[PDB]
Amino acid sequence: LRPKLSEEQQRIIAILLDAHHKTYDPTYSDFCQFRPPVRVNDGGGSVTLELSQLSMLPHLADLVSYSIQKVIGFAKMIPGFRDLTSEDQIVLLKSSAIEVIMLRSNESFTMDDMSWTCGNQDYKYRVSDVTKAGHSLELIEPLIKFQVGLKKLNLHEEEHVLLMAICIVSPDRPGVQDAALIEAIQDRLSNTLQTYIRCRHPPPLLYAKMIQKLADLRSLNEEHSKQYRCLSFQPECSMKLTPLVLEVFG
Numbered sequence: 001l002r003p004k005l006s007e008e009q010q011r012i013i014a015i016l017l018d019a020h021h022k023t024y025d026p027t028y029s030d031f032c033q034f035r036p037p038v039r040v041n042d043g044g045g046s047v048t049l050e051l052s053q054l055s056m057l058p059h060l061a062d063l064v065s066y067s068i069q070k071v072i073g074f075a076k077m078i079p080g081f082r083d084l085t086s087e088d089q090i091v092l093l094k095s096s097a098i099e100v101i102m103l104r105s106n107e108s109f110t111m112d113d114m115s116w117t118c119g120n121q122d123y124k125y126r127v128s129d130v131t132k133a134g135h136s137l138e139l140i141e142p143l144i145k146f147q148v149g150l151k152k153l154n155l156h157e158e159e160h161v162l163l164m165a166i167c168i169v170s171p172d173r174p175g176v177q178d179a180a181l182i183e184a185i186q187d188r189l190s191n192t193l194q195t196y197i198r199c200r201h202p203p204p205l206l207y208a209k210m211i212q213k214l215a216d217l218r219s220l221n222e223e224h225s226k227q228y229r230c231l232s233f234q235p236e237c238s239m240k241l242t243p244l245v246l247e248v249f250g
């Protein structure tokens with residue numbers, strides 16, 4: 001069966017497309033406002049050296065901080081999100097933040113050279129930049145695997161925005177109070193996505209692959225949390241971050 005999208009489902013898709021267009025600048029025009037990228041010599045990927053310098057950390061922390069603000073804005077526009085309590089909205093945003101950033105970064109991600117191309121050479125980010133921010137291969141290798149696997153799904157913009165909305169509105173996040181309300185909002189989003197794929201995605205299993213990406217994001221979130229904890233032990237690290245990053249990941 002291929003039921004047509006209801007008027008309400010068509011409205012949800014329009015709302016989410018508009019939300020993404022207002023909160024994701026595909027020209028990356030604000031990036032020059034961040035603390036500048038610094039790329040030192042570290043061909044060997046020396047952990048001691050990367051931790052002693054964290055050369056790319058101020059630029060990447062400003063980029064993540066900016067992205068969290070945009071994600072907060074996108075989330076406020078998800079139909080139903082405003083019906084949740086303030087406490088539940090914050091629990092969902094804090095727990096999903098890194099996962100939504102990983103999803104949204106797929107738009108700048110290119111398989112041409114396995115980089116995140118956000119403008120000129122200064123804003124072209126690679127694995128080596130993430131290591132220069134104090135992260136290890138345990139996060140980097142599954143991160144690139146996730147980006148390639150997601151890129152290969154060739155998602156329509158409608159599917160990409162619904163995936164980010166489903167990611168945020170997850171009833172199984174620790175500390176949630178009204179899990180039933182969150183689940184109701186997510187089911188409305190999931191049904192819209194499932195109906196959209198069946199009635200709009202041409203051939204050549206897509207929904208199950210998308211659900212799998214959400215599970216992959218949980219593993220990446222856990223690995224990122226462990227790595228952030230290690231990074232927080234580096235003296236003077238806090239100054240290289242932002243108050244928003246400190247609160248979200250602390």
Ligand SMILES: CCC(CC)(c1ccc(OCC(=O)O)c(C)c1)c1ccc(OC[C@H](O)C(C)(C)C)c(C)c1
Binds near residue numbers: 064107224245249
């Ligand atoms: C450079 C790679 C990456 C991938 C998600 C990134 C690339 C572009 C981004 O945007 C352009 C786009 O969304 O199109 C964002 C928003 C992040 C990233 C950036 C920083 C980072 O580490 C951050 C570090 O963990 C702190 C939280 C300590 C700052 C990690 C693991 C990954």
